[PDB]
Structure 1
Amino acid sequence: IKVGINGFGRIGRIVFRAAQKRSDIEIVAINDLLDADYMAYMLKYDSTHGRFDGTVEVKDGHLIVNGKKIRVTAERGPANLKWDEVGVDVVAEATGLFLTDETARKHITAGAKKVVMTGPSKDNTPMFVKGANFDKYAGQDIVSNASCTTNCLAPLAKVINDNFGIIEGLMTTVHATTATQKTVDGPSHKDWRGGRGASQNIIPSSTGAAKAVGKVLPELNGKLTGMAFRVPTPNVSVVDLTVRLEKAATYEQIKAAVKAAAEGEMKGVLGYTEDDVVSTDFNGEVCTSVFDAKAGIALNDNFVKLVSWYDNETGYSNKVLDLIAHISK
């Protein structure tokens, strides 16, 4: 599978890094508004993920990564990208600018066969989350991989709902700082809290991840909503899910049910630990949802708070590639 990346931001770069360790996917082209030498620097050095484990060199305005040449472009309009030349099958839409059908379809008019959006859709483009509803993919040519937080919540919510039935749930994610935030108090006209200094503050934030679960798991439609707190850590976030269960279930039953999925049909997607973990212990986590057995607490058999960690860059990026491979089957 030959794939091109549009947007070499946080997600595009780690999608690129993760794709190197895969045998079924080849990155052949990248498009961003930055020169290739700068793109090389951003790939070689990363304050969160360490130095690139490979070779990066610039030759004639293009990138040579581990011997393979990657066509570099800097086109602003996605109709122009000429995806035909390097022969790309799927395009990873990681700019955040093109989250509709008409936006991303310009990739298909430019020669790509299918595209995966590295963010939640803004129209009705179908969203797919591994562990949740990958098995419901119906050959659509443009898909969304939802968001970091949905990829953490949905697999956990599916296991809980399938074994015990979620009547209703309220969610809080304690989220690491992201590129949208400011170093000091600065302008953020659509989200006033979000403009305050990120390193000084716990910042409440809205989120649609809890309701978006209703789209990937229609059973839970209208039963979850939530919010977020942004805190001054560079990476790794944690979901705090408070749910009511129709079927009584002790905490040990919940642990066993999650551990079973983590070792079975959801291996590599849902993780499970009983160790004294903290957030940095998941820097690099490929699982999109690691259940923290000892951090959760139950008030009784039908009212429980469940905790699950996610590397909001590494897990999401690896599942973007899983979605790319899945829609290419």
Structure 2
Amino acid sequence: KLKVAINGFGRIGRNFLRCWHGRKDSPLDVVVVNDSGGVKSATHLLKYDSILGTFKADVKIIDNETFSIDGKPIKVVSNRDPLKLPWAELGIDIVIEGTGVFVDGPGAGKHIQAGAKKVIITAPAKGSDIPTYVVGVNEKDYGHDVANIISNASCTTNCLAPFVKVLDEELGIVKGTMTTTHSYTGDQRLLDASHRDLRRARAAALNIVPTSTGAAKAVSLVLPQLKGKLNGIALRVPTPNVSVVDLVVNIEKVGVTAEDVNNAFRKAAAGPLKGVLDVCDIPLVSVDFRCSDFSSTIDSSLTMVMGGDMVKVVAWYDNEWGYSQRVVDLADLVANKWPG
């Protein structure tokens, strides 16, 4: 039911579409895209992705600005400004800001103005009325109709926020430093001379790009108890869709060994936040954490607690497709809460 137009056919946009199609409960009725590439673009980026590869389903190419997907007639508005897609003419209940560039208040405010009733944003929104509602913690702090335009901070947050709540509830974070192996972000370019882009004006990929992302403390807002308790660096890895956040503290607890820490995780990662937190213990790397619909994949096989207060949690996450799973969690929950 939840009318779906993606503001630009994003990597998060296509990943979310493939999620939704792989999702079942999803009231997200894909009906439009603000893809300023055309139906061939939205197709050969959906129908041809990489994380989920060739798309599992048929993106039925009806007219460029209105196609279908397995009989989901999806418009395209090959157009930019959130107002430019007329979210009322297309009745888009939840905007999916695929661009993540109108993350501000008025940015997706224009989504609403063109006729959206709620919006979801694929980045730590730079807007206050745009709560980066994360899966795992403050997607629940989203009373329906409350700040209609809710963002969803990056999958760095969508990983951290849930299990950093889990840490502060089961082990307790005093001051948890983080360094997420997040992807080389889109605020870069493949090569140097990117843009203003203070540091990341280097190439996006040809080196590790350790840059403190806002996501580092975009977990702070979503976790009202994580105030300052995460100063993190998103080492934008040269790897497209996968990451592992990691937390080291002078922990609130004495620092019981990472065994019972990750046991409390396991109970949280299988209970409170299963499908969200994963206690990975098989020795595995990004391939399995690729397409990880988990918000968090705690590589508990590597989490460690050295000096006691020294802790370490190694929480992987697919940071676009798994991130798109986070955005679908947000959208589904919001749809359940929707006035209808």
TM-score above 0.5:
yes
Residue of structure 1 equivalent to 2:140: 135
Residue of structure 2 equivalent to 1:200: 206
Aligned counterparts of 2:92 and 2:192: Cα–Cα separation in 1: 42
Residue of structure 2 equivalent to 1:43: 46
CA deviation after TM superposition for structure 1 residue 120, in Å: 1.0
The letter of the residue matching 1:31 is N
User: What is the TM-score with the length of structure 2 in the denominator?
Assistant: 0.90
Residue of structure 1 equivalent to 2:124: 120
After superposing the two structures, state which structure 1 stretch, 183-192 or 155-164, moved more: 183-192
- Asked whether 1:105 is paired with 2:109, we answer yes
Residue of structure 1 equivalent to 2:91: 87
CA deviation after TM superposition for structure 1 residue 309, in Å: 0.5
Alignment of 1:217-232 (within 5 A): 217-232=223-238
SS of residue in 2 equivalent to 1:327: helix
Residue of structure 1 equivalent to 2:68: 64
Residue pair 2:159, 2:315 contacting (<8 A) in 1 also: yes
After superposing the two structures, state which structure 1 stretch, 162-171 or 79-88, moved more: 79-88
Residue of structure 1 equivalent to 2:20: 19
CA deviation after TM superposition for structure 1 residue 268, in Å: 1.0
After superposing the two structures, state which structure 1 stretch, 109-118 or 182-191, moved more: 182-191
Aligned counterparts of 1:190 and 1:56: Cα–Cα separation in 2: 35
SS of residue in 2 equivalent to 1:241: strand
Work out which of the residue numbers 244, 250, 259 in structure 2 matches 1:252: 259
CA deviation after TM superposition for structure 1 residue 162, in Å: 0.8
Aligned counterparts of 1:275 and 1:10: Cα–Cα separation in 2: 29
Aligned counterparts of 1:190 and 1:65: Cα–Cα separation in 2: 37
Residue pair 1:94, 1:119 contacting (<8 A) in 2 also: no
- Asked whether 1:213 is paired with 2:253, we answer no
The alpha-carbon distance between structure 1 residues 107 and 199, as it changes in their structure 2 partners (threshold 3 A), is closer
The letter of the residue matching 2:20 is A
CA deviation after TM superposition for structure 1 residue 306, in Å: 1.4
The alpha-carbon distance between structure 1 residues 39 and 127, as it changes in their structure 2 partners (threshold 3 A), is closer
> How many residue pairs align between the two structures?
328
CA deviation after TM superposition for structure 1 residue 300, in Å: 2.7
Residue of structure 2 equivalent to 1:160: 167
The letter of the residue matching 1:129 is V
Residue of structure 2 equivalent to 1:144: 151
SS of residue in 1 equivalent to 2:68: strand
After superposing the two structures, state which structure 1 stretch, 270-279 or 45-54, moved more: 45-54
Work out which of the residue numbers 260, 273, 284 in structure 2 matches 1:266: 273
SS of residue in 1 equivalent to 2:150: strand
Would you tell me which structure has more strand in proportion to its own residues? 1
User: What is the TM-score with the length of structure 1 in the denominator?
Assistant: 0.93
Residue of structure 2 equivalent to 1:169: 176
The letter of the residue matching 1:78 is P
The alpha-carbon distance between structure 1 residues 218 and 247, as it changes in their structure 2 partners (threshold 3 A), is same
The alpha-carbon distance between structure 1 residues 60 and 251, as it changes in their structure 2 partners (threshold 3 A), is closer
CA deviation after TM superposition for structure 1 residue 243, in Å: 1.2
CA deviation after TM superposition for structure 1 residue 155, in Å: 1.3
SS of residue in 2 equivalent to 1:105: helix
The letter of the residue matching 1:226 is G
Residue pair 1:250, 1:300 contacting (<8 A) in 2 also: no
Residue pair 1:105, 1:142 contacting (<8 A) in 2 also: yes
Residue pair 2:4, 2:33 contacting (<8 A) in 1 also: no
Work out which of the residue numbers 229, 241, 264 in structure 1 matches 2:247: 241
List gaps (5 residues or longer) in structure 2. none
Aligned-residue CA RMSD in angstroms?
A: 1.8
Aligned counterparts of 1:321 and 1:203: Cα–Cα separation in 2: 28
The letter of the residue matching 1:213 is V
Aligned counterparts of 1:109 and 1:179: Cα–Cα separation in 2: 26
Aligned counterparts of 2:187 and 2:204: Cα–Cα separation in 1: 10
Deviations 1:199-226 (A, max 9, x none): 4312221222232222111112122201
Aligned counterparts of 1:314 and 1:75: Cα–Cα separation in 2: 24
Aligned counterparts of 2:188 and 2:295: Cα–Cα separation in 1: 23
The alpha-carbon distance between structure 1 residues 83 and 209, as it changes in their structure 2 partners (threshold 3 A), is closer
Aligned counterparts of 2:157 and 2:257: Cα–Cα separation in 1: 25
